[PDB]
Design a protein around this ligand. Structure first.
Ligand SMILES: N[C@@H](CSOO)C(=O)O
Ligand SMILES: [Fe+3]
Length: 186
């Protein structure tokens, strides 16, 4: 039975229930994430920005089944074209807007990676990606408004690949956390 999360804390409790087993009902997880109405007071602790690039701030470790984190995107900050290491990845906007550009997995032959589609993700909306859907880039294209998003990955992963848009060549990258549970983790 899926109920509306009343607060971020309630959302976390609900997620622990939805991930108690060995599989993931993607549509139910997406629905509960969408239903949580972003309340900035509840997540201010995690919203730690860096001047030069987007930051990843761990909120909950999901008793091992998932990581829930808040990403903070300065004006003009974006990601690489990347995969998600055989994990489910949910993205919900808490503040601002992000542009998501989708790409196909490259062929082994070196070639320009052409965009398959793009969309604008708006406040409170929840998107989903996995490697079977494709690769993506996420960017805050705003010149005036920082963006904040809530991300859930299951299983957790701390490495992925970044893809060179001009060739499709990939490189392994290790992901780091700017903070964990509200504490800066240099
Ligand atoms: N996967 C990127 C953010 S775009 O993914 O919903 C990251 O976790 O840093
Ligand atoms: Fe991503």
């Amino acid at each position: 039975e899926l109920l509306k999360p009343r607060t971020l804390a309630d959302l976390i409790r609900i997620l622990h229930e939805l991930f108690a087993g060995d599989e993931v009902n993607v549509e139910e997880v997406q629905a509960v994430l969408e239903a949580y109405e972003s309340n900035p007071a509840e997540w201010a602790l995690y919203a730690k920005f860096d001047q030069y690039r987007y930051t990843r701030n761990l909120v909950d470790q999901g008793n091992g089944k998932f990581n829930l984190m808040i990403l903070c995107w300065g004006e003009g900050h974006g990601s690489s074209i990347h995969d998600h290491t055989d994990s489910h990845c949910f993205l919900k906007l808490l503040q601002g807007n992000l542009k998501e550009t989708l790409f196909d997995w490259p062929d082994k032959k070196s070639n320009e990676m052409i965009k398959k589609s793009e969309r604008t993700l708006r406040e409170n909306q929840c998107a989903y990606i996995n490697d079977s859907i494709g690769l993506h880039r996420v960017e805050n294209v705003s010149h005036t408004e920082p963006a904040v998003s809530l991300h859930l990955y299951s299983p957790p992963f701390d490495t992925c690949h970044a893809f060179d848009q001009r060739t499709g060549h990939k490189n392994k990258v290790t992901m780091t956390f700017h903070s964990k549970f509200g504490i800066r983790t240099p």
